[PDB]
């Protein structure tokens, strides 16, 4: 699974996600990646999110939209919402993985509860950061 999120100079947020699924997948199984609100969500009023993990749990938990609702309705910060969804709510349902997210203010979060997540980010005109472990 791969994904990207961005905030552009005009204040717009977008998100995108793509996958080949899982090795040895049952043909016809669909995980969170193509499902709006599960593996991909963007709303200029709150946040842009792209996920990667245990497909079934990100769907049942509507992880991408949940970040947004937590922020918009719960008043949580991007960091508090990411913490709650990735570090508490998903492992509680047997889920593992992570996500990337940018809020309408420009805050960036790349939470994951696994040993690794291939990831990178950066502001326009600046040096990017890349990551695998940690």
């Amino acid at each position: 699974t791969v994904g990207a999120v961005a905030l552009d100079l005009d204040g717009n947020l977008a998100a995108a996600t793509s996958t080949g699924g899982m090795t040895n997948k049952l043909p016809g199984r669909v995980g969170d990646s193509p499902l709006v609100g599960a593996g991909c969500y963007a709303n200029n009023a709150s946040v842009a999110v792209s996920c990667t993990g245990t497909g079934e749990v990100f769907i049942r938990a509507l992880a991408a939209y949940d970040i947004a609702a937590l922020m918009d309705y719960g008043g949580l910060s991007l960091a508090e919402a990411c913490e709650r969804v990735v570090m508490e709510k998903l492992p509680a349902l047997g889920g593992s993985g992570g996500l990337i997210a940018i809020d309408h203010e420009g805050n960036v979060a790349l939470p994951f509860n696994t040993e690794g997540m291939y990831r990178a980010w950066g502001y326009a005109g600046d040096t990017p950061t890349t990551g695998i472990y940690r």
Partner: protein, 156 residues
């Protein structure tokens, strides 16, 4: 806030004791190259939607990541690919699931967004819509890599 981008190439399938430094270096190089292209597009004033679309197209083309070229194999030794894109301005979205003959699933997803009244298309119906709009039909063999095939046999 300034313009910014983040990308990912998958969480979970990563173990330091099972990785080598030349492999880690290839991943860092690819992530850096793609996030940099996104940064420069943002700096140049491109839209958030065009940026994420391009970044995920590049991640699909890259055989290191499980999306597009480089996709894992199903148990039938096929490739089934899925993708989504969403525009936070209009809240329009486009998605495809279970496609095998489209080189870049995220471009098909954007096509569903941009050139149809719909949000999600699946399977051969999704492929036939995309061909009708001029997208190329490819053989699913093009996504195949030895590395992912060996992984399927190892799982077996």
């Amino acid at each position: 806030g300034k313009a910014v981008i983040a990308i990912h190439g998958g969480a979970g399938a990563i173990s330091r004791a099972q990785m080598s430094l030349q492999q880690e270096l290839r991943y860092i190089e690819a992530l850096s190259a793609i996030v940099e292209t996104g940064q420069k597009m943002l700096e140049a004033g491109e839209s958030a939607l065009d940026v994420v679309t391009e970044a995920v197209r590049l991640l699909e083309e890259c055989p290191l990541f499980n999306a597009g070229i480089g996709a894992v194999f199903t148990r039938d030794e096929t490739h089934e690919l899925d993708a989504c894109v969403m525009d936070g301005n209009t809240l329009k979205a486009g998605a495809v699931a279970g496609v095998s003959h489209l080189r870049n699933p995220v471009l098909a997803a954007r096509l569903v967004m941009e050139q149809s009244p719909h949000v999600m298309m699946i399977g051969e119906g999704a492929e036939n819509f995309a061909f009708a709009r001029g997208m190329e039909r490819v053989s699913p063999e093009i996504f195949s890599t030895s590395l992912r095939y060996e992984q399927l046999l190892a799982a077996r």
